[PDB]
Design a binder for these strands. Structure first.
Lengths: 120, 123
RNA sequence: CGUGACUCU
RNA sequence: GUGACUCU
């Protein structure tokens, strides 16, 4: 299973992610979107419950800023939710998120928690 | 290289080759085999590249030549058909081991039966 | 990973 | 082999 953080690097011709310090430009985001859209991905942040999702889109907003309705609505930043619920401080908050599933449903995953499913 | 269920059964029931077993399985043999197969995932080989996966929940008491299930006919009416007969009409397949049982997969009352010979064990 | 629904049986 | 939920 290839980490999406390695994949972005190959698509955008980096050798290290610390070679992209800023948010992606619109150009880069589009290039990357063309390669990952419609791939299946599996999440890394729930032990062996590697839930798989189809990639619908890539977010325009880095994970740091991208928001979703949380009800307990107090629209939340994707990053925050991973500190809160998952005890996880993203290393790459500047990077966008993968939009997975029903677009309507605002399911957003940081790159650093996603592996592309190979398999057979 | 997924393992044929027809080989696995030879391992479980200590057959040399499957041609040993020219007769249906006794109840003893069936219980013995079910203990080892229940719960595994298998994939099918008879829909070309549509290699669907199911969870085994049981082994049939009847061979595929006699095992029946409720089939709704293209009328309204629903009648009973045998597994071997269905594999002939639907899949144009004529089973080599009709005297062997079927794997029952996912959920009892779904009456989903697959002949051994059409199934491989997935890792 | 697991369960169902699935193109089944 | 496809989609669904233990989500975000």
């Amino acid at each position: 299973a290839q980490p999406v953080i390695e994949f972005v690097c190959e698509v955008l011709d980096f050798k290290s992610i610390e070679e992209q310090q800023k948010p992606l430009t619109d150009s880069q985001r589009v290039k990357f979107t063309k390669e990952i859209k419609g791939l299946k991905v599996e999440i890394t942040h729930c032990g062996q419950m590697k839930r798989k999702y189809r990639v619908c889109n890539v977010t325009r907003r880095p994970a740091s800023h991208q928001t979703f309705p949380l009800q307990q609505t107090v629209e939340c930043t994707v990053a925050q939710y991973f500190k809160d619920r998952h005890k996880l401080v993203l290393r790459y908050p500047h990077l966008p998120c993968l939009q997975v599933g029903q677009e309507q449903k605002h399911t957003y995953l940081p790159l650093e928690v996603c592996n592309i499913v190979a398999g057979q």
